[PDB]
Every structure is written in C-alpha cells, then in structure tokens.
C-alpha cells in the first residue's frame, strides 16, 4: 500500500517509537504556557468565528511538523485540485465527485468532461426555491384545496440521514413551515405510525432516491401512494402530493409521479454528500429556501477555506491528520463525536455515516490490500448526558478514544438569563480539562481527607477515585449554531475525510459493501413464503428461518 | 490482576496464538452439519421464544469449554449469589446491587443489613399502581379540573435513559395513556422547546433524581416550577402537578414537593439499573401499570434463568464470555448492537451507558490497575438503516467488530400483509450470512461476466468488489416484542454486563468519573460571569473561556 511505503509515515512511526514516552498533557501546557495559541485555528467566515483549539492532543511542535510533510508527501492538494476542477477522482465508479458543485455560490464554472455542470445545479436550486415558495405560502395546495402542514420525506441512508440531521438542528428556523417527518426504515413500524398522524389532504410526500430502485425507499412509497389512494381514489391527485428527488425520470413515472414533479442530481453527487442537492428539498420547505441558501453559503465559505489555506494552518488537513496520528501510529479505532447542543443531537450519527461509509476500505486506488488501518467507529450523543453515561470509559476505562467536543457560544434558547447556556459551557469546558489533567493519588488522597473519611476506609476507596488523564480532545467553538454555521462545519468535516482517504490511498466515494448490501434479501425474501422448512443456505441462516416459520404464528 | 493470573485464561490465550487460523466460519459450517444445533439456545419463557443463535462465531467446541471454565475458575456463580443475596457487592461504595429485588415477583425475602426489602419494594409498587390508575382514569385533576394530557420526566443518565429507551420500545401499548416527553440536558433548548408544546392545566411534572441534588435536573426542575408557578399563580397548585422519585425525603420538601408525591427507591438501585423502581413511573403511566408488571416479570424470568441454568446453556453467560474471547483474545475494542426494530431506535443507546459505566474500568478488586482490556465501546442503530451506512466499515474496513443482531419474528404493525417485515427479516437473514461468507475473487469475477462488463470495466472494478468475511455475528430473535420479552432481553444483557464484570474483577456498579463530571463544572462556572480574561487554568481551558467572552456579545 502506498501509506506504508511513504517516507513521511515511516520517519512519523520512528519518532511515534523513540519519543511517544514524552507526550504528557499535563506536563506539555505546564512547560509551554503559550501552547493555546501555538495549537489552535480562529477562522472569521465574516458571519461567526470557529475555534479550532487542537492543543489538548499527544502532539508537538515536530509531530505537526511531520504529519503536515505526510500530507505533503501523499499529495493531498493535488488530489483536493483534482475533486474541485471535476476529474473522476471516484475511479472505481468513473465518476466526478462535485457536492463542491451543489453549493458553489461564486459560480465559477466547474468541468466535467469540458461542460461546465453550475447551469444544471442552479436550474434545480430555482426550481426548489419556487416549489419552497409555494408549498409554504398555500399556493400549492391538495387534491381537496387545502394548504400543505406536512411534509413527508421517504428516503433511506445518504436519502433520509442528512435532511433529518440539519431539519433537527435548524428546528429554531421553521416557524410558517410545514412540519417535516422523516420515514427511512423498512421496518412497516416506521411508515405506520407516521401515516396514522397524518391527513391525506395536507400531506405532501418526497420520494428521496438517486436510483428510485432502493427496495426500503420504493416499498415505503407505495405504502403511502396506497394509503393516500384509499382517501383520493383518483389516481391525478398524486400529482400534488408526491414530489420526487431522484436521476431517473423512466423510474419516477413508472411508479405514477409526474416528471415535473422530479428535482434532478447527478452520479457525482454521492448520497452521503447529497443534502446540499435537490435530496434538500425537505430542509428548504422546513426553514425556507433563504436559510437554504444560507447552510450551502457556509459550506462554500468552508470549501474555499479548505482550497486557498496552507496545509499547516488548513482546519479539515488538520484534523485529517491528528486522525492519522491516532489510528495508524497509536492504534485508536474509535473517534467520539460529542456536540453540546441538544438540536445536533443527530449530527454523531450523520458522521457516522459519512466517515465510515467513506473510509471503511481495504482496497488502495491500485487495487492492493492495505497493510495498515483505514477509518475509524464514529460514534457520540450530545453533552452533557454523555457525562453521566459512558464518559465513564472514556475517563476511567482500558481505551484511548479521540473526541471532537463542539459548542455554540451563543444559545437559540437563553433563558433563564442564560443560567442554563453557562451551566452547559461549564461543563464542556471542565470535561475537556479533566480529559487532559486527570487527578493523581495525592489530589484524591487530600480530597478524601477533607471529605471526613477514615484512614482505611480512605485508602480502601482511594485508587478507584484516581484518574491517570493525558485523554486528548479537540474543541470546536463556534459562536452560534446558524444556517450558514452548520454548513460550514458539515463541509469541514467532509473535507477532513476526504484528506485522510487521500492519505490512506483509498477511494471515499464508492460504496460496494452498501451495494452488495442491496442485493442480498432478493435470494432470501422468497423462502420466507409458506410452512415449508429451508435447507438452501449455511446450517444458521436456515435454523433461523425455520425458527421464524415455526414462531410465526405463536400466540403470546 | 486477577484474570491475566488465572490458568483457565492463559490456556485460552496459548490456544488462540496457536490455533487462530482453524477460525474460517465458511470451513467450520462447511465440516459440520449440526453447527447451528450445537451453537444455540432456543429459550422457551412461556411468553414467547428467544433465539440466541451464536454459531456465525469465531469459536469451536473447544473455545466454548475453555471459556466454560473461565467462568468457573473466576467464580462467576458464586458472585452471582452474592448479588441476589444482598450482599454488598459494590464494594467501593459499600452497597448491595439489588435491581433483581424490583422485578423480584416470587417475593422470595431478600435482606439487606438483616432486613427483607422486599416490603418496601412492593409498597412503592402499590403507589405507583395506585398513581397511575388515577392519572391513566381521568379522576387525578389539574389546577383547573382537566385530565393530565401530558407527562413529562425531568432526569439525567439513569433518571433519563431507560423510561426513554422503554417508552420508545413499548410506544403501540399507549392507547389511552398521556404522552410522555423527556427533558434531561442542562441545555435550556431542552426544556424551553418542550414547554413550548405544553398547557401547564394538563401537563403532569415527574422530578427524577436519586440524590436530587444533580445540577441539570434541579436547575430544569426549578425552571418548569417558574413555567408552571407563571400560569397557576397558586403554590398549592403544585402538588397536582409535580412528583419526584427519588431516595432523599429531605430535599424533595425543600425543592417543595408534597411528601407524599414522593415515590422512593432505595441506595442499592444503580441509576443505569433504575427502570424497574420508582424511576419507571413514566413507564407505567404511558402504557399502565399492567405492562409494567409485565416488563418486570419478563426481567424476573431470565433473572431465574441466570441463576439456575448450567453456565454452558445460560444466555448471559454465553454472551458474556463470547464478548471476553474477542475483547482479550482477539482485542476488539468496540461491540455493535443492531435491532432491526425501529421501537427498539434506541435500545443500543441504552446499552451504551449500561455497558460502558458498569465495566469501562481500570482498578481491580484488590485495588491494583487492571494489564488486560475491559469494557467495550458499544454502539449502534436500528436495521435496516445501517446497511446503507457503517455496515460498509463492518463489511469492507480494516475493524473486526462483534455485532448483535436481534429481531421479533411478529410486528406490531403487519402493514400490506406483512411485506415490510418480510423484506426486514430477509435483510436481516443476508446482512448475517454475508458477514460470514463474503465473496472471493472469483465469485466476483463471474458475476461481473455475467453482468457483461467489458474486461476493462472487470479488471478495473473487479478487487474493490471482493469482501473477506470472516465478520462474526450474534442472531437474537424472539416471538413479539412485548413488555414481558423487552424485559427479559434488557435483564440478559445487565446480566452478561456482570458476568464480563467478574470475570475482569472489577466493580461494575460504582461510576467514579460520572462522580468526579458532577464535581468539574463548579470551579469553571465563576470564571464566566463578567468579561475579565481569565488565566487561572492551562492555556486551552483559558484560551476557550476568552474567546467564549469575545464572541457571547458578538451579532450574527
Ligand atoms: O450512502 C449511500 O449511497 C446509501 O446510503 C444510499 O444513499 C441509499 O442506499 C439510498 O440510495 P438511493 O438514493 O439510490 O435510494
Ligand atoms: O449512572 C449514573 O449514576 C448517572 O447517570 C445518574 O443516573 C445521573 O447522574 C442522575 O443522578 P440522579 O438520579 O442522582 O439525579
């Protein structure tokens, strides 16, 4: 593989062997009382400041130093060239890969194969912005004349996850939206339970796929065209409440939605990159086009950010590369995603998605086997719940666990005269801080004592209440969780996977794990059908559908 | 420590270095014919099956006896009665771990400190029953004569989580009881957006606290008794509208609840073991106290299923030491809990507080620092989502990840004759499957033969769709899930948390880093009041309050 070859990564490993000894938290700020500034980023985007404070991770001055030289070595800007100029850099797929396209608010034009693809994109973003205008208006209106209150996305995967995560977190902003529900799941509890709360005549329905073949995606849209059907009986009155995003218009009127009705991507725009694309639609009816514009307006501040800023001082370079630090030299394979803001409370799980779906590879671009770790577990929940749950291994368990900890300065919510918001920055700030110092046995010695404990009883209790810390965080601060902010910080994160793909050699854009995973029911779902035991399959996927058969009709 | 000293553990470590590469699940399936017979349990409960198949594991007949006598030589039984005699297991605390007394329907004396709580189990019971009845009826009256519409749960962690997780799971037995909200982060856009959507006439507050002095749940409490007080203007209105459970009489009369809307528990109920007490109140007033007793009866089967199975055909135990071979033989750090259940969305959220704070530890018994790993990461989220997401990290990464798979046979929402459920269990019978095979070079190569892909489209795509397998799985499937099965699949996973728990030899009942979380906040929250820069910590801690007091005034 092309990592373990670079001289950069070896000369990283030989100091990571001879030096690793030296990088103590505590003792690193104790020794350079000017460590903040030397190991943080503030990036004005001219609507908010992001801090970037990168000082409380098992680096130095050389470890920077190097991993920006890996960078260098791996031919990180050429490849970031390559994505932003159009080439098919999705090599498996031969395809571009351009979510950069979606929000490029400077439109300046962006080739594929020598076509500029900007009139294309803004030709969908008027016609969404005309469609957000008259769905929320009463314009629009359903097959009895009723203003549209609901808005139903029905999607799954890069489909559902990062509408339903932005909607969750711009929640302040849709005030005179219609409400907006998310159904993704196959699972017949999904579509169920949200239809029985619904009115046929004010609900319009988003059909939600690139390849409008998706089995979960397709089968939760004819259940609602059959419910909806029962109330309308006449089949024209699909054609005002189902809209279609999608790149198929056969497909789209195969299954009864007029082609007018579809708002069009594009192959370069990957699923999990794909909610600054028509798959937006349901964010820009919630909180309006405006804020819209104002989310791909953020992520474009971020993207020239990322093209025009020297690796050292680049934010997404510098996160890729702590990353590197910690999966490939110490061996970490989880990275905990921690936002102290009740409204991202789905943006872990949206990265979860976008990072491991991305570099969970094996298959460098010349077709060999890595020798090395690829992506890490994302995983995380909000603070402060986090704090009286599983920060507990963080704090005191066998596992080093890289966390991202984020906050917004400023609260949509101040009330209390802003007891609660400082209550919640308190918090993220003493976390970060325990993290990193710990408390040795003399700190939990003289506090037991002060406490009142009895000599035993104290040196009983005593190395259970010691934390050996040197636990590294970053801390992303921003200064307030706006339109234009969130966008910005999803974009810095797609940047910063996109740099450690690059890095690793491997393709962030194919998908062939979730792919297969597509085709793998069709062999089974027929066997299901009748009493008759199943012998076809491996000695437990056939114990487990007689199982099935057998308990099918159980009474309980 | 204890387990790295222990013969029956080095004999399985000397095994695995020797033998490892016999682990081939395509050979093992392949060579024997009875694998799913031999590696399952088929649990009748009376109330339903429960399937445990583990056969798609890394493991032979010798592997299984070898962690058989793990279990033994580390004296998993005889902890096991010490938990469900009432002796006082959590050791660093000196407290008996008594969440098997709540769920205790036998009523089979358990003492503690010379005295049967069972007595006192019971009569909070009784109140609850009694409570709730009121509310569910109607007859429990508003300041104003109106039924409760609404119910809301004020906790944090353990106060929070489990009612959360459980009214989720339980949500179609809810016909006819109030709807339930939980409010538990300190970040006031939790409790302001709930009480947004509330009439305080109709809204019924439960103050969910073991020590009730916990700085989000007080400041939240206080902050709806404001809401409340600001309608009502009556002081006494207060006790149609708020209860607390808690263990500590005293400051739920000072906060000024009415002692007798207090509904106890006691020191020996762990927070993350809490659902079943006076903490389930939630529970029983969303979907009654009938399916209430049903959740604590399933809980109380496979507690009596733990206690008297032989180790070798006892879940949790099974569970647990499956969980040991690949935590310290194979060195996985993280364990993926998937149900293919959109009610159970977050049961594994659930389980990642319960796992990681009961057993993400470092010191022993003894009091000496554990040289093995402990506790996992655990994570997931509902199927079949996932499959379009992360499943292609567990596919196609360079992470070898346990995962539990679990499912009901029969939905609560049998929509268009059962077609979802039959497409989400064959999706859930192909993802396992593929996890074990995978699919070689050449299976790959024909399929793109037979798909008619040009030999540079072949050559080209050809290693990036070959997958490895080899990926071990848990199959978990039951009849339905109901109250009584929920309850049985939550105690078998507390019950596996402990067994993992002794045989490290560690507490897994005490939580000192969510202790030392509640004690952080107070030394930072001074320093934020006014716009003086602060210097009194490490330089990040400082630079991040300073560029909090920039940016708190700063218009966007
Ligand atoms: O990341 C992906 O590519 C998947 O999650 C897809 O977005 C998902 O399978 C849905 O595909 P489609 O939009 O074609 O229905
Ligand atoms: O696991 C724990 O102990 C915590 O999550 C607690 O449940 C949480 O801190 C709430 O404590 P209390 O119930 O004392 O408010």
Redesign the pocket.
């Known amino acids: 593989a092309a990592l373990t070859r670079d001289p950069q990564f070896q000369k990283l490993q030989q100091w990571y062997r001879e030096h690793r000894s030296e990088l103590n938290l505590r003792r690193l700020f104790d020794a350079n009382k000017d460590r903040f500034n030397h190991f943080s980023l503030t990036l004005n985007t001219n609507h908010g400041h992001i801090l970037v404070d990168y000082s409380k991770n098992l680096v130095t001055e050389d470890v920077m130093r190097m991993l920006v030289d890996l960078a260098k070595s791996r031919g990180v800007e050429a490849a970031r060239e390559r994505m932003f100029n159009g080439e098919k850099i999705n090599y498996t797929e031969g395809r571009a890969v351009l979510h950069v396209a979606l929000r490029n608010r400077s439109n300046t034009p962006i080739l594929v194969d020598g076509k500029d693809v900007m009139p294309e994109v803004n030709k969908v973003l008027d016609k969404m912005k005309s469609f957000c205008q008259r769905v929320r208006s009463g314009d629009w209106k359903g097959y009895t004349g009723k203003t549209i209150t609901d808005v139903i996305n029905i ?5 559902d996850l990062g509408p339903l995560m932005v909607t969750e977190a711009l929640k302040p902003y849709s005030s005179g939206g219609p409400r907006v529900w998310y159904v993704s799941n196959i699972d017949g509890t999904h579509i169920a339970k949200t239809l029985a709360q619904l009115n046929p005549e004010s609900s319009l329905f988003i059909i ?7 089995q979960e ?1 397709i089968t939760n849209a004819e259940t609602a065209k059959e419910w909806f059907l029962q109330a309308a009986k006449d089949p024209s009155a699909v054609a005002k409440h189902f809209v279609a995003l999608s790149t198929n218009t056969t497909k789209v009127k195969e299954f009864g939605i007029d082609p007018q009705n579809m708002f069009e991507f594009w192959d370069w725009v ?3 990159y ?1 909610l600054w694309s028509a798959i937006g639609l349901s964010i820009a009816l919630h909180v309006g086009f405006d804020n819209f514009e104002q989310l791909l307006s953020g992520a474009h501040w971020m993207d020239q950010h990322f093209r025009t800023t020297p690796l050292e001082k680049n934010a997404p370079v510098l996160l890729a590369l702590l990353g590197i630090w910690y999966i490939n030299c110490f061996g970490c394979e989880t990275h905990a995603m921690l936002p102290y803001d009740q409204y991202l409370h789905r943006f872990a799980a949206y990265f979860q ?1 976008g990072d491991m ?1 991305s570099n969970g590879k094996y298959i460098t671009k010349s077709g060999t086997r890595v020798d090395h770790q690829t992506g890490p577990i994302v995983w995380g929940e909000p603070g402060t719940n986090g704090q009286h749950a599983f920060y507990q291994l963080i704090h005191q368990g066998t596992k080093m666990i890289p966390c991202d900890f984020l906050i917004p300065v400023q609260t949509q919510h101040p009330i209390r005269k802003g007891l609660h918001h400082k209550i919640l920055l308190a918090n993220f700030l003493a976390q970060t801080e325990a993290l990193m110092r710990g408390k040795s046995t003399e700190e939990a010695r003289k506090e037991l004592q002060a406490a009142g404990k009895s000599p035993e009883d104290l040196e009983r209790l005593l190395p259970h209440k010691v934390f050996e810390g040197n636990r590294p965080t970053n801390s992303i601060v921003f200064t307030k969780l706006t339109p234009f902010m969130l966008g910005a910080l999803v974009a810095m994160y797609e940047h910063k996977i996109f740099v450690q793909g690059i890095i690793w050699d491997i393709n962030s854009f194919d ?1 062939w794990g ?1 792919e297969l995973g ?1 085709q793998l029911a069709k062999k089974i779902e027929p066997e299901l059908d009748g009493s008759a035991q199943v012998t076809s399959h491996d000695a437990s996927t056939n114990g487990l559908i007689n199982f099935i058969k057998q308990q099918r009709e159980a009474r309980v």
């Open positions: 999607g799954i995967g890069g489909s939600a796929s690139k390849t409008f073949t998706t995606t990957g699923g999990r794909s998605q779906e998908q979730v597509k």
